């Protein structure tokens, strides 16, 4: 009775169609959901926004176990696929928007799971045009502002700050080396 | 013991615990589960004693007991958890149900207070300080998650109810109010000294537990050393806690050393130690408390155990103070324990310095203390050859370990001569002389100190003999009873290796009959606990094996002993024979543990004889007649029925095999055969039947055994059952000695079995085999519940003596198992004997074994049998037995055995058993038998076994090609060809007699499949054997199809064997026969399909239900059972006959009919999905697979045709690719012609030889593999019936049907077939668009795991890619692939070097790599490769 194509499989499939076919990544970047299109949708939002917010973050209760690894694969593929700037720019813009959104989120394990998972996606993407975009958009400065948008007493705070330091270290190195 | 007395005394309780396991620990765990929910002092006493019990279920209560207002219990709980974590990892291994709640309560106790830097140093927490020199935040609560309280005094009452009041006044985070309770009880404590000291002590315990299992910081060591310096002397328990914490912290060590000051003689820790020691020594100076002194010497031990600490204890000269202790300390139990602690430290220190110890005469001090303690035992136990207090025994033990270590250490090699001119031997003499007052491990240490000394200075063995220490050891190890333990037994031979070392010692050792005494251990129940396997994971008899290997090492050092050792071994065997022969003993699982004796002795003898592999012990043993007592052990009357399967019988067999394989001596087999012949001659009454209506002889010998409760346990009560189980043990020994791969041992085995005695035994074993198959099948016929027999008193007369059903069954079951296990061992033996015989006397062994096969196949019961099933069950196991003996694993025969099986008989009897089984003794002809209603119940099971044997017997590809062929040369020469002539001729008639009759209830599809395999082998074989009656196989292949289709209606699973039969009949006959077959199959499909097309006309008038009937009618009509095999057959035929069957499937138009049927079933399936009761017509997958292979074949034929159009058919140059030079080098002309001819035949592979190297080409891969190296190299062919395929109007209907079958989730395997077809069709984007315009990706996403299969996600990914790859996107992706593959010197499974620049880059190879892209689309692939290459 469980679905035979879980969202995990659908993500791996889309990652493959991105990695092969140029136009698919741009079509995925521009595609956006509509209000009341599904139970999980509150307002018009991109597929990349949904993958960053609802599927990528670790959550303790399974729906599919390995949704986050494959949303990470999906976003990695959508980066690596050159696709000029159509896919990479919308990916980066949406990561910046989802970072600012999760930092403005109220202090919650939902906030720390979103934040940590976005740091993990910035780190996987970073492992060169993506770095050029991260600099132009000031993403490194939004990572550095992360603790301003934390409660520094939270039991999660050190893990989310570590996560935000991981791309800061790599990015500062790649620039200043 | 006194523990049990203390338990009974306790079961004023708290007064008894103040004076000082299961039910006392359970009463304690009781009050623990009670108190935590005249009480507290009971809990405290329970803890203070239990903290001794653990030191030689409560936990979940104890964790709650930390929630106490009176810290005494918190301290005591912590002290118990320290005793735990100190000794064993009991709280570390625990699960997180309570390990984390515990460790968190411990953390909240342990966590820092701010140390010196904030005015909370432990020194200041222990000195009073007036309560005004502490930080003002001490009497203050500041608990946050927000609570702050300036001072706790205006509410000093009831701190627990304060915490509960805070629970009511504020919502405190759940499950962490403990950090509040600990803060609140601290702030109550700090007001006063005792409560501050109790917090200090609880924190120190909690630290120590947390390290034996964030808390530690730079000031903690310095704080602890300042706690140790405080000289109010009322703090010794806090000082002991501080030392125990430092101990935990050892497990920063350089800082511990820098603070305590151990690197110098003057220093706080060394001075403290010396003052403790001096107070312990001199009576005037009061003694430092026992606990504190123990914490000091435990800290010294643990510090010494680490090199930095042992080097510090060198530097401060603690050896001088500790030798002072070991010289001047008294005799009382506490002082003894401090002495043993000092000894263990002087041991650790001497593991890295000797000079201090030697300069302080430490060896004289140790020896004097060993003299003093032995002299204090001497009062209790003055005996010396002409209980010890545990603490003194531990002292002696640690001190003897030190002396042994020193002897094995340089820095005594100069001077160790003067150990044994001290008092030491006079005190060892007392330990060795009193192994019952002193423990066995202490008696061991004493004999090992002598042994190690004699091995360091064998010269001074004369001094040890002069003072008689060796003569006391001999008496204590031989004449006095050896203490029965593993380590003592393991050492006796090493001891004797020392005491023999002087030759005078050897004389004295052999004078006192040492092995008669030493080996008695193996026959004594007192030492069986020493012999029992330890840990249950070391071998059986591991300790007797060690003992035997040590006696081997001993008498390989001392060859003069060999003869007496083997004499005492033979006396062991002769005594085991005595214990097995006479009636008065009975083997326990008077009872005697005989089977354990036999296992232990045999592991001992095995070790001795087989240890060095020099065959001196085997020869001595065999020449002293030990093989008779050995081989007799198998036949022992009072051994149990389950002996032969036991490890003791396998041990005796292993010793016989060791003697055989070492000495190469037949005498083991000769003696085994003599005794087996003696046992077989005893049980001839098993061969003689009742000669009246009667059952089993075993059951007439049992039942007539009076009324004995267990007759089978007595050798006179059941002589035949015990002769059975003796013969069984001998037979398991012959099995073990046949499982041998040395051709020489095989040869002498065969020479023995071929003897007059060998063949007398083998004849008697054959008659025994047939008797045991009879007896076992009769007995099972009697344990069956009045079902198998025909209402007759066949064996009832003896069951009436035996005896309401189980009372009779459970008396027979020992008979049934004793007879069935022996039969299986006989069968294993005969199989091994065939193997040895095959690979002159072998020819007589094989003769007697084929006479057994003839006897088994021609055996007829006595004429009192109530039913033929006893014969059919005899025949089935005779046949299943003759199979292993005529044929090897891998089904190749032994031609010696087939020769003798033919000439002697058993072939005529094999086929007569078939005639008998069908005709029922001539009552009915064979041609009517199979179909007769009254055919016996087991006639299908027999025929399954018979057919499985004959399938092996008929196969020419094994019977001619068998590795086990006879050589080429007075004797009649064998021909496997004439054997196959006569066998196929005899088998064919019997199959005739089964060809078309309806099948049996069970064993009818296995019968059919083996019958078809026999027909295949005959039809393939006559073409090959006429090379070196044809019209009968001709007319058969003509008329066989009515039977083939009868088999397809009854037993669908035979269809693969029917395909193979049809293919062999076709390759015998012409295309005029191929056409007839295929057109007849197609006519069956045609009518079966058109009736199903008429089965699904929409039901307008409602005469039938039109819902459940119609939906399941499509799936259940007989026509819908036929198609599922008529289509599947046609598909297998198609796969072999690729193009004829394609052209017939085209020209018949059947494909249109199957497409129309796939269309017309969709309304039915859809209505079924709406009934929610879908049941898929199984015929859908054959149809989809047939269509799949029709369009696979047409693709391919067009491609092969236009390939032929571009090749000259004469001398097509095949070329092999040289990656190293990058050349497509040609083959020789003979190789090219062979490869081309065999490629044109469509063979998958072709073999040829070049330079005597073997090359093979695989046209699946187009690769030449070198058969020697396995190197794979590419090959090419150098270029210079038209199957229309599915038309657009068919493909359109198929696409809609496949989408509808995805809509209704038809079945996993049917979805797999329909998606495979969609995958082939959609490779044209027009049809991929059709498949995507019918909303199939939604259905595919909606599919549930009930409708899934192994390949689903790969296949779906390929289908989606087929939809995504429109002409332009496919073009661009092909450009990407071509550029990538051409730019990167890609590796392959053709040994094309990775990133090569010749081989990896040739156009002719790269086009081979890009072949998948050319198949994906050849036009686009041309355009891209022309534009990008």
From Swiss-Prot, chain A:
Post-translational modification: Phosphorylated on tyrosine; phosphorylation is probably required for its ability to inhibit TP53 transactivation.
Tissue expression pattern: Weakly expressed in heart, brain and placenta but not in other tissues. Expressed in a number of cell lines, predominantly in those from colorectal carcinomas.
Superkingdom of this protein's organism: Eukaryota
Localization, UniProt: Cytoplasm; Nucleus; Mitochondrion
Disease annotated for this entry: Intellectual developmental disorder, X-linked, syndromic, Turner type: An X-linked neurodevelopmental disorder with highly variable clinical manifestations. Common features consist of moderate to profound intellectual disability, delayed or absent speech, short stature with small hands and feet, and non-specific but recurrent dysmorphic facial features such as macrocephaly, microcephaly, a broad nasal tip, deep set eyes, epicanthic folds, short palpebral fissures and a short philtrum. Patients may manifest other features, such as hypotonia, seizures and delayed bone age.
Notes on the domains: The HECT domain mediates inhibition of the transcriptional activity of p53.
Family: Belongs to the UPL family. TOM1/PTR1 subfamily.
Subunit structure: Interacts with isoform p14ARF of CDKN2A which strongly inhibits HUWE1 ubiquitin ligase activity. Interacts with MYCN, POLB and CDC6. Interacts with isoform 2 of PA2G4. Interacts with NR1D1. Interacts with AMBRA1. Interacts with HAPSTR1. Interacts with HAPSTR2. In hepatocytes, interacts with PAQR3; the interaction promotes PPARA poylubiquitination and STUB1-mediated degradation.
Protein function: E3 ubiquitin-protein ligase which mediates ubiquitination and subsequent proteasomal degradation of target proteins. Regulates apoptosis by catalyzing the polyubiquitination and degradation of MCL1. Mediates monoubiquitination of DNA polymerase beta (POLB) at 'Lys-41', 'Lys-61' and 'Lys-81', thereby playing a role in base-excision repair. Also ubiquitinates the p53/TP53 tumor suppressor and core histones including H1, H2A, H2B, H3 and H4. Ubiquitinates MFN2 to negatively regulate mitochondrial fusion in response to decreased stearoylation of TFRC.
UniProt name for this protein: E3 ubiquitin-protein ligase HUWE1
Residues of the full protein shown: 2062 to 2259 of 4374
UniProtKB/Swiss-Prot annotation, chain B:
Location of the protein in the cell: Cytoplasm; Nucleus; Mitochondrion
Tissues and organs where the protein is expressed, per its UniProt entry: Weakly expressed in heart, brain and placenta but not in other tissues. Expressed in a number of cell lines, predominantly in those from colorectal carcinomas.
Residues recorded as bearing Phosphoserine in the entry: 536-537
Domain of life: Eukaryota
PTMs per UniProt: Phosphorylated on tyrosine; phosphorylation is probably required for its ability to inhibit TP53 transactivation.
Residue ranges of domain WWE in the record: 1200-1277
Quaternary structure and partners: Interacts with isoform p14ARF of CDKN2A which strongly inhibits HUWE1 ubiquitin ligase activity. Interacts with MYCN, POLB and CDC6. Interacts with isoform 2 of PA2G4. Interacts with NR1D1. Interacts with AMBRA1. Interacts with HAPSTR1. Interacts with HAPSTR2. In hepatocytes, interacts with PAQR3; the interaction promotes PPARA poylubiquitination and STUB1-mediated degradation.
Record comment regarding domains: The HECT domain mediates inhibition of the transcriptional activity of p53.
Family assignment from sequence similarity: Belongs to the UPL family. TOM1/PTR1 subfamily.
Disorder noted: Intellectual developmental disorder, X-linked, syndromic, Turner type: An X-linked neurodevelopmental disorder with highly variable clinical manifestations. Common features consist of moderate to profound intellectual disability, delayed or absent speech, short stature with small hands and feet, and non-specific but recurrent dysmorphic facial features such as macrocephaly, microcephaly, a broad nasal tip, deep set eyes, epicanthic folds, short palpebral fissures and a short philtrum. Patients may manifest other features, such as hypotonia, seizures and delayed bone age.
Function recorded in the entry: E3 ubiquitin-protein ligase which mediates ubiquitination and subsequent proteasomal degradation of target proteins. Regulates apoptosis by catalyzing the polyubiquitination and degradation of MCL1. Mediates monoubiquitination of DNA polymerase beta (POLB) at 'Lys-41', 'Lys-61' and 'Lys-81', thereby playing a role in base-excision repair. Also ubiquitinates the p53/TP53 tumor suppressor and core histones including H1, H2A, H2B, H3 and H4. Ubiquitinates MFN2 to negatively regulate mitochondrial fusion in response to decreased stearoylation of TFRC.
Protein name: E3 ubiquitin-protein ligase HUWE1
Species in which this protein is naturally found: Homo sapiens (Human)
Chain's gene name: HUWE1
Portion of the full sequence shown: 17 to 1893 of 4374
């Amino acid at each position: 009775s469980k679905p035979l194509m879980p969202t995990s499989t659908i993500l791996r499939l889309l990652a493959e169609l991105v990695r092969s076919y140029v136009g698919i990544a741009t079509l995925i970047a521009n595609y956006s959901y509509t209000v009341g299109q599904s139970e999980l949708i509150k307002e018009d939002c991109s597929v990349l926004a949904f993958v960053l917010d609802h599927l990528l973050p670790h959550t303790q209760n399974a729906e599919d176990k390995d949704t986050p690894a494959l949303a990470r694969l999906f976003l990695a593929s959508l980066a690596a696929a050159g696709s000029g700037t159509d896919a990479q720019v919308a990916l980066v813009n949406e990561v910046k928007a989802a970072l600012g959104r999760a930092l403005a989120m109220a202090e919650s394990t939902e906030k720390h799971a979103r934040l940590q998972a976005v740091m993990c996606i910035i780190s996987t993407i970073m492992e060169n045009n993506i770095i050029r975009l991260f600099l132009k958009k000031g993403l490194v400065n939004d990572l550095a502002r992360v603790p301003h948008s934390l409660d520094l007493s939270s039991p999660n705070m050190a893990n989310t700050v570590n996560a935000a330091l991981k791309p800061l270290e790599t990015l500062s190195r790649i620039v200043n080396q | 013991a006194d523990c049990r007395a203390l338990i009974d005394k306790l079961k004023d309780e708290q007064l008894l615990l103040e004076l000082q396991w299961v039910d006392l620990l359970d009463r304690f765990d009781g009050i623990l589960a009670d108190a935590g929910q005249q009480l507290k002092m009971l809990l405290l006493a329970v803890l203070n004693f239990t903290a001794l019990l653990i030191e030689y279920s409560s936990i979940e209560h104890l964790t709650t007991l930390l929630a106490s207002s009176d810290m005494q219990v918190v301290l005591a709980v912590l002290n118990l958890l320290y005793v735990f974590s100190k000794r064993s990892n009991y709280i570390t291994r625990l699960g997180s149900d309570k390990r984390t709640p515990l460790l968190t309560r411990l953390q909240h106790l342990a966590e820092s207070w701010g140390g010196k830097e904030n005015g909370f140093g432990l020194a200041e927490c222990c000195r009073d300080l007036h309560m005004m020199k502490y930080p003002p935040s001490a009497t203050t609560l500041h608990f946050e998650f927000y609570i702050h309280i300036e001072q706790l005094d205006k509410i000093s009452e009831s701190p627990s109810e304060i915490m509960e009041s805070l629970t009511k006044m504020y919502s405190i985070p759940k499950d962490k109010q403990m950090l509040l309770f600990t803060h609140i009880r601290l702030a109550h404590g700090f007001s006063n000294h005792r409560k501050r000291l109790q917090a200090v002590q609880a924190r120190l315990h909690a630290i120590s537990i947390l390290v034996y299992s964030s808390i530690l910081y730079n000031g903690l060591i310095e704080e602890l050393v300042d706690v140790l310096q405080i000289t109010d002397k009322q703090l010794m328990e806090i000082k002991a806690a501080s030392l125990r914490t430092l101990t935990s912290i050892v497990h920063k060590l350089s800082s511990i050393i820098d603070c305590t000051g151990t690197a110098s003689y003057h220093g706080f820790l060394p001075v403290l130690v010396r003052n403790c020691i001096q107070a312990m020594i001199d009576p005037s100076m009061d003694p430092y408390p026992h606990q504190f002194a123990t914490a000091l010497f435990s800290f010294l031990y643990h510090l010494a155990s680490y090199d930095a600490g042992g080097e510090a204890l060198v530097s401060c000269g603690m050896m001088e103070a500790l030798l002072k202790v070991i010289k001047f300390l008294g005799d009382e139990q506490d002082q003894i324990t401090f002495v043993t602690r000092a000894v263990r430290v002087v041991d650790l220190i001497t593991n890295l310095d000797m000079a201090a110890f030697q300069s302080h005469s430490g060896l004289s001090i140790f020896i004097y203390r060993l003299e003093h303690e032995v002299d204090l035992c001497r009062k209790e136990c003055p005996f010396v050859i002409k209980q010890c207090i545990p603490q003194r025994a531990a002292l002696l033990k640690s001190m003897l370990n030190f002396l042994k270590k020193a002897i094995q250490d340089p820095a005594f090699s100069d001077g160790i001569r003067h150990v044994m001119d001290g008092s030491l031997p006079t005190s060892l003499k007392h330990i060795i002389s009193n192994a019952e007052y002193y423990g066995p491990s202490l008696f061991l240490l004493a004999t090992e100190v002598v042994t190690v000394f004699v091995f360091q200075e064998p010269s001074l063995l004369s001094s040890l003999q002069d003072n008689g220490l060796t003569d006391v050891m001999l008496h204590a190890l031989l004449i006095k009873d050896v203490p029965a333990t593993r380590e003592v037994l393991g050492s006796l031979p090493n001891v004797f290796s020392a005491l023999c070392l002087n030759a005078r010692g050897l004389q004295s050792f052999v004078q006192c009959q040492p092995f008669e005494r030493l080996f008695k251990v193996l026959l004594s129940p007192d030492y069986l606990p020493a012999m029992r396997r330890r840990r249950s994971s070391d071998p059986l008899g591991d300790t007797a094996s060690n003992l035997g290997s040590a006696v081997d090492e001993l008498m390989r050092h001392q060859p003069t002993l060999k003869t007496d050792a083997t004499t005492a071994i033979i006396k062991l065997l002769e005594e085991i024979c005595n214990l097995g022969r006479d009636p008065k003993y009975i083997c326990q699982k008077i009872p005697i543990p005989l089977m354990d004796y036999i296992l232990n002795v045999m592991k001992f003898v095995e070790s001795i004889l087989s240890n060095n592999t020099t065959d001196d012990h085997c020869q001595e043993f065999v020449n002293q007649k030990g093989l008779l007592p050995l081989v007799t052990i198998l036949g022992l009357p009072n051994l149990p029925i389950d002996f032969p399967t036991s490890a003791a019988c396998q041990a005796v067999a292993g010793v016989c095999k060791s003697i055989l394989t070492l000495s190469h001596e037949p005498k083991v087999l000769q003696e085994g055969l003599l005794q087996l012949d003696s046992i077989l001659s005893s049980l001839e009454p098993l061969h003689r039947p009742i000669e009246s209506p009667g059952g089993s002889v075993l059951l007439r010998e049992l039942a007539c055994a009076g009324n004995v409760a267990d007759a089978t346990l007595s050798a006179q009560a059941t002589p035949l059952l015990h002769a059975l189980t003796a013969a069984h043990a001998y037979i398991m020994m012959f099995v073990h000695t046949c499982r041998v791969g040395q051709s020489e041992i095989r040869s002498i085995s065969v020479n023995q079995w071929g003897s007059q005695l060998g063949l007398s035994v083998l004849s008697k074993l054959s008659q025994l085999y047939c008797s045991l198959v009879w007896e076992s099948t009769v007995l099972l016929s009697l344990c069956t519940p009045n079902s198998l027999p025909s209402g007759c008193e066949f064996g009832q007369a003896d069951m009436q003596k035996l005896v309401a059903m189980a009372a009779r069954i459970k008396q027979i079951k020992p008979l049934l198992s004793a007879s069935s296990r022996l039969g299986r061992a006989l069968a294993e033996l005969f199989g091994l004997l065939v193997k040895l015989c095959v690979g002159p006397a072998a020819r007589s062994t094989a003769s007697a074994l084929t006479k057994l096969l003839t006897k088994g196949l021609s055996w007829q019961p006595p004429p009192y049998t109530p039913t033929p099933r006893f014969r059919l069950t005899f025949f089935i196991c005779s046949v299943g037995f003759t199979s292993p003996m005529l044929f090897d694993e891998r089904k190749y025969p032994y031609h010696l055995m087939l020769q003798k099986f033919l000439c002697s008989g058993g072939h005529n009897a094999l086929f007569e058993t078939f005639n008998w089984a069908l005709s029922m003794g001539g009552k009915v002809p064979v041609s009517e038998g199979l179909e007769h209603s009254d055919l016996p119940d087991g006639t299908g099971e027999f025929l399954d076994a018979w057919l499985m044997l004959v399938e092996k017997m008929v196969n020419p590809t094994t019977v001619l090609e068998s590795p086990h062929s006879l050589p080429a040369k007075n004797f009649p020469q064998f021909s496997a060809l004439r054997f196959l002539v006569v066998t196929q001729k005899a088998a064919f008639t019997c199959i005739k007699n089964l060809w078309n009759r309806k099948p049996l209830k069970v064993y009818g599809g296995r019968m059919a499949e083996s019958m078809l395999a026999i027909l295949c082998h005959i039809l393939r074989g006559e073409p090959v054997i006429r090379e070196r009656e044809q019209d009968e196989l001709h007319t058969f292949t003509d008329t066989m199809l009515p039977g083939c289709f009868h088999l397809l209606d009854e037993l669908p699973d035979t269809v693969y064997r029917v395909c193979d039969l049809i293919m062999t009949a076709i390759k015998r006959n012409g295309a005029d026969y191929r056409d007839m077959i295929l057109k007849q199959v197609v006519n069956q499909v045609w009518e079966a399909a058109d009736v199903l097309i008429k089965a699904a006309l929409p039901l307008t008038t409602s005469d039938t239900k039109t819902v459940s009937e119609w939906i399941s009618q499509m799936a259940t009509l007989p026509q819908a059972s036929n198609l599922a095999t008529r289509i599947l057959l046609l598909t297998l035929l198609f796969e072999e006959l690729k193009l004829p069957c394609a052209w017939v499937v085209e020209s018949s138009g059947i494909l249109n009919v199957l497409i129309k049927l796939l269309e017309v079933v969709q309304p039915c399936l859809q209505a079924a999905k709406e009934q929610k009761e879908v049941q898929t017509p199984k015929w859908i997958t054959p149809v989809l697979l047939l269509i799949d292979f029709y369009e696979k074949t047409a693709i391919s034929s067009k491609r092969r045709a236009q390939m032929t159009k571009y090749l000259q058919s004469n001398s097509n140059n095949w070329r092999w690719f040289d990656d190293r030079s990058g050349r497509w080098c040609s083959y020789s002309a003979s190789n090219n012609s062979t490869i081309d001819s065999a490629w044109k035949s469509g063979e998958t592979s072709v073999r040829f030889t070049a330079g005597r190297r073997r090359y093979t080409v695989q046209f699946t891969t187009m690769v030449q593999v070198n058969e020697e190296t396995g190197n794979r190299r590419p090959v090419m062919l150098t270029l210079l019936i038209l199957i229309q395929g599915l038309t657009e109007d068919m493909v359109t209907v198929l696409i809609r049907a496949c989408v509808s079958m995805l809509g209704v989730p038809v079945d996993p395997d049917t979805l797999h077939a329909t998606l495979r077809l969609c995958l082939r069709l959609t490779r044209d984007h027009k049809y991929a668009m059709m498949f995507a315009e019918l909303k199939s990706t939604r259905m595919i996403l909606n599919l549930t795991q009930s409708s899934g299969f192994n390949g689903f996600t790969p296949l779906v990914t390929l289908l989606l890619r087929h939809i995504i790859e429109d002409p332009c996107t496919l073009r661009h992706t092909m450009e990407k692939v071509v550029r990538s593959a051409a730019t990167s010197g890609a590796g392959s499974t053709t040994s094309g070097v990775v990133s090569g620049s010749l081989g990896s880059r040739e156009i002719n190879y790269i086009l081979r790599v890009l072949g998948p892209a050319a198949c994906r689309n050849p036009d686009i692939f041309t355009e891209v490769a022309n534009c990008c290459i």
